């Protein structure tokens, strides 16, 4: 609740962004938060298959209704709960908060960095991060540069 209050709201773009590290990010966030009503589609499909089997073999309607309810109950039981989903949602929310803070700083300093950005684009043809490039340069200096 604290992290979700700090974040305010979550948009699908950030979920897609975090899909890089958590492919099941949406499947965990849906079980963690009351975003949309979740129907046991797989359980209902299994129940429909059992219903077809019962119709083919002439089983009682009570039996086929029970065999439809049972897979639905199993799906609901395996769906609800799952506090591991809450843990992964906490991780995703931390990632999203950090991303939003960095984005806010970017927007704040866009005008200040506009002028420097043009010469950096006109001088450096690589799109890699300045921090990574500077770390690589520091390593290169530490290795090759003569101590003298």
Partner 1 sequence: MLDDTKYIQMAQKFPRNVSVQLNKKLFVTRTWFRNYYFVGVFGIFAYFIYNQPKIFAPFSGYPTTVAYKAQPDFLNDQVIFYSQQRQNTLKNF
User: In the complex, which residues of this chain contact partner 1 (CB under 8 A)?
Assistant: 2, 66, 70, 74, 77, 81, 83-84, 86-87, 90-91, 94-95, 98-99, 101-103, 105-106, 109-110, 113, 116-117, 120-121, 127-132
Query: Which of 5, 58, 125, 131: binder of ligand 3PE (CB under 6 A)?
Result: 58
What is the rounded CA–CA span in Å between residue 96 and residue 18?
A: 8
CB 72 within 8 A of CB 47: yes
58: partner contacted, choices ligand 3PE, partner 1, none (Cβ within 5-8 A by kind)? ligand 3PE
CB burial readout 120-141, b (16+ within 10 A) else e: eeeeeeeeeeeeeeeeeeeeee
Using the rule CB under 6 A, is 61 a contact of ligand 3PE? no
């Amino acid at each position: 609740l604290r992290r979700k209050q700090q974040l305010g709201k979550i948009y699908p773009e950030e979920v897609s962004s975090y899909t890089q590290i958590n492919p099941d990010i949406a499947n965990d966030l849906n079980l963690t938060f009351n975003a949309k009503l979740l129907w046991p589609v797989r359980g209902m499909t299994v129940g429909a298959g059992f219903f077809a089997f019962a119709h083919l073999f002439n089983l009682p309607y009570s039996f086929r209704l029970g065999l439809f309810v049972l897979p639905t109950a199993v799906e609901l039981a395996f769906t609800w709960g799952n506090k591991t989903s809450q843990f992964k949602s906490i991780e995703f929310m931390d990632y999203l908060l950090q991303y939003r803070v960095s984005k806010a700083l970017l927007e704040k300093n866009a005008k200040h960095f506009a002028e420097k950005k043009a010469a950096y684009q006109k001088e450096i043809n690589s799109s890699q991060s300045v921090q990574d490039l500077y770390n690589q340069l520091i390593t290169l200096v530490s290795e090759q540069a003569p101590s003298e």
